[PDB]
């Protein structure tokens, strides 16, 4: 019922997952 | 910002989508 | 959240996603 | 079953689900 | 001769390598 | 370097290795 | 647990076949 | 775009590059 | 242990977990 | 080679072991 | 436009990403 | 070493190259 940490590789593996076709950004920066 | 939000804090894969196009 | 084309070990990283702490049953036919 | 499923044809993020503890 | 540390997704990576068709169960809270 | 198949989430892990802190962004057809 | 014995502690893929089903 | 062509053909990293931010 | 069926990174991955600190060579026929 | 058999037919984690330094 | 850490399996991930078939050698204890 | 020079310190995928066959 609580969230992880999601970092680097992982972070952007999550947001192929969630997003997919969709694409997305990573920009750590912001 | 992403990494603030998800790596330093937590998200849930809810938040995650407002990171998607 | 986006459908899902997941073999192998893919299938695994995106079950550790969804399930968090939950934690999670990993079940192939065999 | 699942891990077929989502190999031979598409699965969802809600059907995975379903295999939480 | 020793052993490392698997944490996260790298622990149910290795779990899908070493039960594969058997099936695992991941349950961290346990 | 050489070249490259990727395929799915490989080629994600592979935007984030060479894009480091700059970030990417990852789209696919639709 | 597996995160005790594994993450926190270390563990051989041995030990890792005891989550095995 | 970039991510068919690295999936049914091959791609570089130098081609990868052009979509760093 | 099961049989395995690697691809790509995916025998990499494998390498590293059953080799440990002993490290490994990665050899693909050229 | 090993890369080759993994990728197409099937290999044992003991094969594997024999590629560790 | 700095670099980032890459450690363990993500190590070995960029390892074969810009050796691939040239092979390569993890060898941590060296 | 490698350890030492790409994860304990930092290393550009340059210098990754050096641990190629
Ligand atoms: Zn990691
Ligand atoms: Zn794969």
């Avoid at chain 1, 019922?1 to 997919?20: K, R």
């Avoid at chain 2, 939000?5 to 989508?17: A, F, K, V």
Wanted: glycine fraction near 8%.
């Amino acid at each position: 019922f609580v969230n992880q940490h999601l970092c680097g590789s992982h972070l952007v593996e999550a947001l192929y997952l969630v997003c997919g076709e969709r694409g997305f950004f990573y920009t750590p920066k912001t | 910002g992403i990494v603030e939000q998800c790596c330093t804090s937590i998200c849930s894969l809810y938040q995650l989508e407002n990171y998607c196009n």
